[PDB]
Amino acid sequence: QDLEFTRLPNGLVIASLENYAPASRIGLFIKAGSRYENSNNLGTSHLLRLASSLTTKGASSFKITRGIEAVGGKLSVTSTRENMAYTVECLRDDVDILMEFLLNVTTAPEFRRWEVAALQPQLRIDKAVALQNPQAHVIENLHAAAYRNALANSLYCPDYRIGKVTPVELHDYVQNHFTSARMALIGLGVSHPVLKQVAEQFLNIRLSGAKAKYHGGEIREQNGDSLVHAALVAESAAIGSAEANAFSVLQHVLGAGPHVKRGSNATSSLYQAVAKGVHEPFDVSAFNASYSDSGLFGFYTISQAASAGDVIKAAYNQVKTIAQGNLSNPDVQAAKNKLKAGYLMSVESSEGFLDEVGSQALAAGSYTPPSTVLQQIDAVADADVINAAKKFVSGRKSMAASGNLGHTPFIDEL
Amino acid sequence: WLEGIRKWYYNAAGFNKLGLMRDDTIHENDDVKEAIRRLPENLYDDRVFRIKRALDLSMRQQILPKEQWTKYEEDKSYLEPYLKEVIRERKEREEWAK
Amino acid sequence: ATYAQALQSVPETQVSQLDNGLRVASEQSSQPTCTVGVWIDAGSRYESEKNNGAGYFVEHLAFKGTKNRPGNALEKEVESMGAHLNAYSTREHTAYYIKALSKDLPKAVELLADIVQNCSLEDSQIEKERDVILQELQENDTSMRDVVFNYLHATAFQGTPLAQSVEGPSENVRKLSRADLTEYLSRHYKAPRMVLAAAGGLEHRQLLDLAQKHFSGLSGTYDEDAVPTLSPCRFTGSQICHREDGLPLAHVAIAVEGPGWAHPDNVALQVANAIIGHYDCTYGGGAHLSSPLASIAATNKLCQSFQTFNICYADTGLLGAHFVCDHMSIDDMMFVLQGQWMRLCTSATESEVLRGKNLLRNALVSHLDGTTPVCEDIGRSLLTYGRRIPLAEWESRIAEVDARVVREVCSKYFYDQCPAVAGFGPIEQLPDYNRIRSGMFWL
Amino acid sequence: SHTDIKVPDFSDYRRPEVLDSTKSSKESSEAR
Amino acid sequence: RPVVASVSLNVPASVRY
């Protein structure tokens, strides 16, 4: 079976792929990430990410949470600095119910006064579980340091903002960003006319965002942890540009993450380069982030306190060698075999598949099948792979780090 | 004719002679405590002060002058939207259980 | 289309055998990716106290040297190929496997012979891992959840090999020899008690030739009295507690004897756990949830997280739960938990059954969204149940389940039984074993 | 560590019906 | 790594990378 793909006058994409699978599935990818939050309404998407299960017009916060659990589905909300998915699942015998629950979330949220009040202090837990995993305030400060206006808005909400969010400060948001011109009622395990029915009957309804003006800057977090974390990046390019596909392969050239469980990561140029001289624990890998307007590229650090400089000055020097022409072709064609795999393996699962069918539909307007991508990986140039790192090295630098920072250098000391 | 009687009963109950309204005097239960929790500040404190003086005057057995009394046309039903909202959820919570 | 039509349209798995004993199976599907592995019958339950921790220690050296691909060469032929490689042990089973593309498959299966059979186990590496192991026992002290189950399995199955850990005590790991590995290796890796499986982009006869090519030389037999069978692992009702008031939270678990793999009422019990379910401090349902154990813990904020389970071993299993809560709220949770089991053994509302039935369906299915979950279920099925089970068979078994069965099952395995209890943290409020059992039976 | 832990043997204290670790419970439990 | 948020009604809230 093949993938339908359409478009209404309202600009509302649809998709459908009746794989004759038992487990239906739906996604509604939307552009409402943290970037469209201005200075006043910070952290609102964090709240709105929890605002599922709340009251609607078509049903209550109670009926939703029980009707779903009866049929046995889900209601998950993946969200990014760009996008805001309202994914679900179910058995295909009972889609017509769960669809009705969904659009009442988006098309008719009441966002009553008091249900919010119970829902705010949940954030102090949500925000807290993440930062047990220390990456997600290292990585946030990059966007906070590097970019300025939109993409610097963390997914998560600042502390002081909690206790103070307004419901009007959602209605204004929803009526300005859940708009049929920039949505995508994706489907799966389900037929196409069914979705074409519902969208025209409920989603047949009617702001913008500024661009990520890169700056170049550094933020520091002396927070007593026993280890160090650090990231060092430079201006990448957005997706769709073939300049992207040079980075995304340059990722695996340089540091990919472990492909072998408990492996020495031999083929990684960077991790191998650290392994000489260093004789203590560490780990390190590439960081590629490619948003619609812009992106970032660099690497991410894990080391002890004293050995931050002695590790970062392996990465920076190494990538210079990758920019000074010192490179081979089989590394690339080996690296492509990784990139050509992770794309396919990511879309192995229906969910990871579903993450890609619509993420294209919002920035782009057409579904690129896997084959057409693998050509774009084959048509890559070893003068783009280089540049690439030339853009990184010559480019302005943004940086952040967390842990003990008594021996961690700035940019300029590199 | 009816409506000439509601306006009269509301004058005989006494609770216009104490600066109060109708929703003020309701028996408090779980169904109602929900609503009084759900009210906004501007109206909630306005509930408090209506009570807080009626008590002090049911202490003395005094009342307000005839001018400051409450008027039937002004007997605002400020609580009914917030209440019937609840019992909707209650019967949704019960019949869904059966 | 519909549901029952769907499971019929699913690929019916295929099976094969080899003269040595190595079962083989697979499942064709249109995924360009694939994944292949070797899901076997070997772990700590077979270890004795002298070779304890072996089944884990091997797992680090297999990918760290062979005879025909020593050093980082094996690690290089995957990365260069662009696949992932993975392994994991257990207390009974074990598994190595690959995630790779379809066309590059004939190279993958070649390696596992070079790994399973031809692991060289060089001593310079044996000493390094012997330090790495003593670095992760330090870590799993912090993986507080896994400490509990290691205590739980250690009590209810006391005296048996099954109370053993996976990585083994720190003592034996500083005493284990090449010969113990060689002797351990040379007994359990045998074709009749092994499996190969894969699915995604392949055909079953792209594969059968390849094990006929590579694995045909495997030792398909043994010295007549060398390959033991199982002991029935008994069950104890006993409590264990690692009182530690200094820590933030207290991880706790309780469970009873499980029936086993083969016993069909597991399809009943998975429903009952689904009726109870799970919660951890993030679900936006709160009070409006359905499982009473959740809405209470959201309402009263008694706990932070808890989950049920159902572990199943050869002729027994483990049924119970794990929960995490502040010290001032343990006793309150346990009353509620016990209240539900007695409620289910006695008064299981039919309307509440169809939930768990409809919950379970969206586990096994959604679990099988990919290839790697499939290839676990295959390689695990061919050593537990025997035949893999087509999912339209589970469904028929479930639709037999009504409220009459549950009241019989839970009576058999919960009511008045001799549970096993575990504790690790500020458990100043944790009630005595007697109080737990007295709270086991309503009235 | 938490693996070096071990449970002692109460076989000086148990019932006779259960001393044989190789056997199972559930056949004398109903009697116990 | 390009971290992404995820919460739910029944899936444990998480941090993809």
Residue numbers in the entry:
A (entry chain O): 22 to 227, 232 to 439
B (entry chain F): 12 to 109
C (entry chain N): 2 to 444
D (entry chain R): 1 to 32
E (entry chain V): 62 to 78
Task: Copy out sentences from the published article reporting this entry, exactly as the authors wrote them.
1 is the central component of the mitochondrial electron-transfer chain which is responsible for the electron flow from ubiquinol to cytochrome c. This occurs via the oxidation of ubiquinol and the reduction of ubiquinone in a process called the Q cycle. Ubiquinol is oxidized to ubiquinone in the oxidative (Qo) site, with two protons released into the intermembrane space, while ubiquinone binds to the reductive (Qi) site, where it is reduced to ubiquinol and takes two protons from the matrix. This process allows proton translocation from the matrix space to the intermembrane space, thus increasing the electrochemical gradient across the membrane.
GSK932121 is a 4(1H)-pyridone lead compound that has been found to be highly active against atovaquone-resistant P. falciparum, but failed in a first human trial because of acute cardiotoxicity. The apo data set was resolved to a global resolution of 4.4 Å and the two inhibitor-bound complexes were both determined to 4.1 Å resolution as calculated by Fourier shell correlation (FSC = 0.143; Scheres & Chen, 2012). For the two inhibitor-bound structures, there is clear inhibitor density at the Qi site which does not appear at the Qo site, supporting that these are selective Qi site inhibitors. 1–GSK932121 map is strong for the pyridone head group but is weaker at the tail of the molecule. The density also suggests that there could be two binding poses of the compound caused by rotation around the oxygen–carbon bond (as discussed in more detail below). However, gross changes in the side-chain position can be detected; for example, His201 shifts in position between the two maps. For SCR0911, His201 is well defined and is in a position consistent with hydrogen-bond formation with the inhibitor, whereas the density for GSK932121 suggests that there is no hydrogen-bond inter­action with His201 and the density is more poorly defined. Pyridone binding pose 1 has the trifluoromethoxy group from the second aromatic ring pointing towards Met194. In comparison, the cryo-EM structure has identified pyridone binding pose 2, which shows the aromatic ring facing in the opposite direction with the trifluoromethoxy group towards Asp228. Comparisons with the crystal structure reveal that the GSK932121 ligand adopts one binding position. As the additional binding pose was not identified using crystallo­graphy, cryo-EM could provide unique insights into alternative modes of binding and occupancy of inhibitors.
